[PDB]
Amino acid sequence: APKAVIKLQPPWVSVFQEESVTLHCEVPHLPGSSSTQWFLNGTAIQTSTPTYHITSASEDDSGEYRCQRGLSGRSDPIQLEVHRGWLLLQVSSRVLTEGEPLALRCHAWKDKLVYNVLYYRNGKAFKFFHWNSNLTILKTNMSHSGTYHCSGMGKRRYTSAGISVTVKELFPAPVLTASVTSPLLEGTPVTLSCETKLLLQRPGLQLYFSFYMGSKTLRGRDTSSEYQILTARREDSGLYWCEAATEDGNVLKRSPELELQV
Amino acid sequence: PELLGGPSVFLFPPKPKDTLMISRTPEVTCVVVDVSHEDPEVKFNWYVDGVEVHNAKTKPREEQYNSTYRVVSVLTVLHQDWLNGKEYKCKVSNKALPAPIEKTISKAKGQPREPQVYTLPPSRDELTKNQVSLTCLVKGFYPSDIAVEWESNGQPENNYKTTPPVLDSDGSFFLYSKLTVDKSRWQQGNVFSCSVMHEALHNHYTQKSLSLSP
Amino acid sequence: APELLGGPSVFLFPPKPKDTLMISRTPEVTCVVVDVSHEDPEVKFNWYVDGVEVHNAKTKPREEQYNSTYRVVSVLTVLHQDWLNGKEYKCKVSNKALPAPIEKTISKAKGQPREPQVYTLPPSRDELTKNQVSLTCLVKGFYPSDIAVEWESNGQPENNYKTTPPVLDSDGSFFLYSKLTVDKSRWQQGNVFSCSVMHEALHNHYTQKSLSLSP
Ligand SMILES: *[C@@H]1O[C@H](CO[C@@H]2O[C@@H](C)[C@@H](O)[C@@H](O)[C@@H]2O)[C@@H](O[C@@H]2O[C@H](CO)[C@@H](O[C@@H]3O[C@H](CO[C@H]4O[C@H](CO)[C@@H](O)[C@H](O)[C@@H]4O[C@@H]4O[C@H](CO)[C@@H](O[C@@H]5O[C@H](CO)[C@H](O)[C@H](O)[C@H]5O)[C@H](O)[C@H]4NC(C)=O)[C@@H](O)[C@H](O[C@H]4O[C@H](CO)[C@@H](O)[C@H](O)[C@@H]4O[C@@H]4O[C@H](CO)[C@@H](O)[C@H](O)[C@H]4NC(C)=O)[C@@H]3O)[C@H](O)[C@H]2NC(C)=O)[C@H](O)[C@H]1NC(C)=O
Ligand SMILES: *[C@@H]1O[C@H](CO[C@@H]2O[C@@H](C)[C@@H](O)[C@@H](O)[C@@H]2O)[C@@H](O[C@@H]2O[C@H](CO)[C@@H](O[C@@H]3O[C@H](CO[C@H]4O[C@H](CO)[C@@H](O)[C@H](O)[C@@H]4O[C@@H]4O[C@H](CO)[C@@H](O[C@@H]5O[C@H](CO)[C@H](O)[C@H](O)[C@H]5O)[C@H](O)[C@H]4NC(C)=O)[C@@H](O)[C@H](O[C@H]4O[C@H](CO)[C@@H](O)[C@H](O)[C@@H]4O[C@@H]4O[C@H](CO)[C@@H](O)[C@H](O)[C@H]4NC(C)=O)[C@@H]3O)[C@H](O)[C@H]2NC(C)=O)[C@H](O)[C@H]1NC(C)=O
Ligand SMILES: [Mg+2]
């Protein structure tokens, strides 16, 4: 059986003291009339409904939540922090894989008003809003990893504490090989490769490769990793480029141009 | 009432030396910060004593390190207009503003007063050291806009500091300028000049000299 | 109609330089809380000297300001050498309009202290045509900028003087001038005037230089 999955409503992993949040224990097997096991830092919680509602958060609510229903595996932990302060930088997740969107919010204590908000990554403000606004980055990549905070103008300028967000890489730049020899006697068997491999344990994820010449195509998105023209006439000579991407295309990377001489 | 938000405006006067030398170009500088990418267009209207002028030069948008834009408009001014107390108004319009922002600047009001300029040799106690301090006392001037320089034999001196103007009990200002020179240059009898530029001086300047003499 | 975020703000002030340099005086650290609301006026202070908590503080009574807020002040006497040695003083402010207590710390300005050089400069010959006359005290080469300069004559304080702010010099030390204005009759009658300087880098924290018509 697959694992349970916890979802936060609102999705923010950091809240203010006395704020409200609801934890949803989702199991793909949709059960009926079956209890839910909730855990705070390994300790069982005296609540068995499929959702767990914190009505007024305090320090005692902080830690790792995990949940389990039916014959499911226990869920991966979600970490909820409860903070005091003027401004709180809220994020939708602390860890992500490239391609997965990241949501950010500059939350004012007791929902008061700030304006002229700045969002910072690693000390530098990268986004400015006259009116307080959430911010979403759809196509995340490794460079979006860093320490996030925000500031805004209320009666005075206030600044949030930092929070760390990691965007994990999926595969490096798919470098293109050179089979043996350049230059070459035309009438020699080709073999060309695209050098990239997965960095995370993605059990059934498949990468799709496609080899280029100058710009016009040779072979489109295919599950095989090697382009093999039967035996080379140097019409297939010069600019060689590879591209490796996920099936959805939301993570795609380049490679150096291959010196090809047949 | 969520009027709050939008760009801010800062209006800066000319450098004192630029208003006093007909050679140089005095400018008033209107700076707009916190311009967003969503509403990047900034419009400047300039008025001199209420009557609009159209000769200002606007530099293009410049992205700041906090990812906001900064836009600057530079208005060249006539020396006598500024010195006669004409008012300079900058009016800034931008879609993120509920109404234009207006800033007005002018020379400080009040009857100008001529500075008295006195040069003071180093204290005898200082002659035991390798470098001595040459002192220029400038007092009794109004307004506080002034410029002070040191030179010797037609060349600028590379090593002097000047205090800010300080308010005196009579409503006028005073300051001091400290020129530091090698003891040998002072004892060898070189002449050093303190040049003071202020609107209330004849030809907008005076200069007094200082040299070792027993 | 949501209101702007914000509450009380805290400003934390160092002792007067002269108070820390004279054992006969009492140096104090001052914790000023502004924008205290009428609805929540209760303010609580906690003081900490180099981490350790102290209880010798004194909090003045509130005072309304024209913007219809309160301004509570808490004064903490400090030990001279504790301040001169660089210990840090922390003020902790608590109020219901705050999400958490505000903390501010101060300490002596860090950096290698440099001894002031003090020079008195008589009036320029060309000023001797005026009714009043300028006596000049040059203090240069000192660090930090915390300093105190005064004038006296015949045991009595001369108070008709102005002193410029410290100015950063091109060698990283500070300087200033102090200008004492006196009637030209007093100067030419031979009366002696003295510039008194107090700074942490001087021997005994004090030096003085005198000035009078030489011949
Ligand atoms: C996003 O970034 C921007 C950009 O900032 C830069 O980048 C960021 C990322 C940071 O790295 C930052 O540190 C960088 O500077 C931020 O923009 C800043 O915004 C703040 C306000 O939020 C502005 O603060 C005001 O500054 C005034 C002084 O500015 C000068 O001095 C500073 C250094 O001291 C310089 O950095 C400035 O650029 C200004 O420099 C002057 O520029 C003039 C124009 O070019 C020069 O004159 C011209 O010079 C040329 C020569 O080249 C010719 O000679 C021309 O002829 C001549 O005209 C001038 O030489 C130069 N001076 C110096 C020393 O270099 C302050 O005056 C002002 O204070 C007033 O307003 C405050 C209200 O906010 C108030 O609190 C103050 O009390 C004061 O109020 C005044 O009080 C007096 C009484 O004393 C009254 O009489 C007045 O009426 C009253 N005035 C007003 C208007 O109320 C501000 O502190 C800052 O200037 C600005 N920086 C820049 C570069 O534009 C932005 O804030 C960031 N956004 C966010 C959300 O974070
Ligand atoms: C509502 O009203 C109140 C009341 O205000 C007053 O009342 C009415 C009548 C009004 O008309 C108003 O004009 C009046 O001022 C408002 O309260 C004010 O709030 C503002 C902020 O909003 C405060 O501004 C800060 O001021 C600091 C320095 O203030 C001193 O100097 C001014 C005059 O220059 C005085 O008015 C102050 O009272 C302070 O004066 C000091 O008073 C002390 C008394 O406790 C003295 O210490 C003690 O003195 C006794 C003797 O009595 C013994 O000697 C003790 O031993 C000794 O300890 C002290 O000597 C005396 N000094 C002087 C010189 O007189 C500024 O430092 C501060 O600026 C910092 O912060 C800014 C933003 O926060 C920032 O922009 C600055 O850059 C600066 O940041 C600092 O920068 C330096 C570098 O320069 C760095 O090294 C620092 O690390 C850095 N620090 C920080 C934290 O950033 C502010 O400008 C104002 O002081 C305060 N007034 C009073 C009276 O308390 C209130 O704001 C109003 N509300 C609204 C919404 O308007
Ligand atoms: Mg005088």
For chain B, the three-class secondary structure string (H helix, E strand, C coil) is CCCCCCCEEEEECCCHHHHHCCCCCCEEEEEEEEECCCCCCCEEEEEECCEEECCCEECCCEECCCCCEEEEEEEECCHHHHHCCCCEEEEEECCCCCCCEEEEECCCCCCCECCEEEEECCCHHHHHCCEEEEEEEEEEEECCCCEEEEEECCEECCCEEECCCEECCCCCEEEEEEEEEEHHHHHCCCCEEEEEECCCCHHHCEEEEECCCC
Is B212 touching ligand 1 by the criterion CB < 6 Å? no
**CB-based contact C25:C19 (threshold 8 Å):** yes
CA dist list (Å): B16 to B160, B165, B166, B172, B197:
18, 13, 16, 17, 8
What single-letter amino acid sits at C106? I
Angle, CA of C15, C19 and C24, to the nearest 5°? 145
Where among C107, C140, C169 does a domain terminate? C107
- List the domain range (segments joined by +) for residue A130: 84-172
Per the CB < 8 Å rule, is A113 touching C3? yes
3-state helix, strand, coil in chain A (%, to 5): 5, 45, 50
Q: DSSP letter at A232?
A: B
Task: Check whether residue C74 and residue C136 sit in a common domain.
Answer: no
What single-letter amino acid sits at A73? G
What's the gap between Cα A27 and its chain centre? 22
C-alpha R_g of chain C: 22
Q: Is residue C49 part of a domain?
A: yes
Q: Is residue C2 part of a domain?
A: no
Task: Check whether residue B124 and residue B206 sit in a common domain.
Answer: yes
- Assess C209–B contact: CB distance below 8 Å, yes or no: yes
- End-to-end CA separation in angstroms for chain A: 54
Q: Is residue C112 part of a domain?
A: no
Q: Pairing between strand C70-77 and C89-94?
A: unpaired
Is C32 touching ligand 2 by the criterion CB < 6 Å? yes
CB contact residues (below 8 A), chain B span 15-54, against chain C: none
Q: Determine the distance in angstroms separating the CA of B49 from the nearest CA of chain C, rounded to an integer.
A: 34
Residue A213 is inside which H or E element, if any? strand A208-213
Task: Check whether residue C95 and residue C125 sit in a common domain.
Answer: no
Determine which residue's CA is closest to atom 45 belonging to ligand 2.
C30
Angle, CA of A203, A204 and A209, to the nearest 5°? 120
Other CB atoms within 10 A of residue A236 CB = 17
Q: Is residue B1 part of a domain?
A: no
Closest CA to A126 of A154, A155, A106, A107: A106
B92-121 exposure pattern, b = at least 16 Cβ within 10 A, e = fewer: bebebbeeebebebbbeeeebbebbbbbbb
- The strand order across the sheet containing C89-94 reads C52-54, C44-49, C89-94, C102-106
- Assess C7–A contact: CB distance below 8 Å, yes or no: yes
Per the CB < 8 Å rule, is B36 touching A153? no
Q: Where are the beta strands (DSSP E) in A4-123?
A: 5-9, 14-16, 21-26, 36-40, 43-44, 51-54, 63-69, 78-83, 87-91, 95-97, 102-108, 115-121
Where among C107, C138, C157 does a domain terminate? C107
- Give the CATH number for residue B60: 2.60.40.10
Task: Check whether residue B136 and residue B180 sit in a common domain.
Answer: yes
Kindly compute the dihedral angle of the four CA atoms of residues A41, A44, A45, A50, in this order, to the nearest 10 degrees.
100
Task: Check whether residue B206 and residue B123 sit in a common domain.
Answer: yes
Residue in chain C lying closest to B161 (CA): C169
Residue in chain C lying closest to A115 (CA): C4
Closest CA to C76 of C24, C13, C30, C10: C30
Q: Is residue C48 part of a domain?
A: yes
How many Å apart are CA A130 and CA B96, to the nearest integer?
A: 8
Angle, CA of C165, C173 and B134, to the nearest 5°? 75
How many Å apart are CA A57 and CA A21, to the nearest integer?
A: 8
Task: Check whether residue A57 and residue A24 sit in a common domain.
Answer: yes
Q: Is residue B111 part of a domain?
A: no
| Resolution stated for this PDB structure, in Å | 2.5
Task: Check whether residue B124 and residue B172 sit in a common domain.
Answer: yes
Task: Return the ligand 1 atom nearest residue B14 CA.
Answer: 56
Task: Check whether residue A78 and residue A89 sit in a common domain.
Answer: no
Q: Could you give the count of Cα atoms lying within 13 Å of A98 in the half-sphere of its Cβ?
A: 20
What's the gap between Cα A203 and its chain centre? 17
- Assess B68–A contact: CB distance below 8 Å, yes or no: yes
Q: DSSP letter at C114?
A: B
* DSSP bridge partners of A117: A129
Task: Check whether residue C37 and residue C122 sit in a common domain.
Answer: no
Task: Check whether residue B142 and residue B96 sit in a common domain.
Answer: no
Question: Both tokens of residue A38?
Answer: 């909730």
Q: Which residue has the tokens 């509570």?
A: C72
Q: Which residues of B touch A133 (CB under 8 A)?
A: none
Task: Check whether residue C102 and residue C141 sit in a common domain.
Answer: no
- Assess A96–C contact: CB distance below 8 Å, yes or no: no
**CB-based contact A82:A57 (threshold 8 Å):** yes
**CB-based contact B210:B119 (threshold 8 Å):** yes
- Assess C2–A contact: CB distance below 8 Å, yes or no: yes
Task: Check whether residue A72 and residue A141 sit in a common domain.
Answer: no
How many Å apart are CA A105 and CA A127, to the nearest integer?
A: 12
Q: Is residue C4 part of a domain?
A: no
Query: Which of B4, B38, B67 lies closest to A115 in CB terms?
Result: B4
Q: Is residue C67 part of a domain?
A: yes
CA dist list (Å): A249 to A218, A252, C82:
19, 6, 65
Q: Which residue has the tokens 């591209």?
A: A243
Q: Which residues of B touch A125 (CB under 8 A)?
A: 65-68
**CB-based contact B182:B200 (threshold 8 Å):** no
Residue of B18, B24, B33 to test ligand 1 pocket, by largest number of atoms within 8 Å of CB: B33
Residue in chain B lying closest to C166 (CA): B163
- List the domain range (segments joined by +) for residue B206: 116-211
* DSSP bridge partners of C28: C77
Other CB atoms within 10 A of residue C176 CB = 23
What phi, psi does A261 have (nearest 5°)? -140, 110
How deeply is C78 buried, as exposed, middle or buried, from its count of CB atoms within 10 A (0-12, 13-18, 19+)? Answer: buried
How many Å apart are CA A193 and CA A189, to the nearest integer?
A: 14
Q: Which residue has the tokens 């014959």?
A: A71
How many domains, chain B? 2
Query: Which of A17, A84, A155 lies closest to C5 in CB terms?
Result: A155
Where among B86, B105, B124 does a domain terminate? B105
Task: Check whether residue A61 and residue A108 sit in a common domain.
Answer: no
How many Å apart are CA A174 and CA C88, to the nearest integer?
A: 56
Question: Both tokens of residue C176?
Answer: 């200033």
Task: Check whether residue C143 and residue C121 sit in a common domain.
Answer: yes
How many domains, chain A? 3
Residue of C4, C13, C37, C104 to test ligand 2 pocket, by largest number of atoms within 8 Å of CB: C13
Method: X-ray
- Assess A156–B contact: CB distance below 8 Å, yes or no: no
Residue in chain A lying closest to B69 (CA): A128
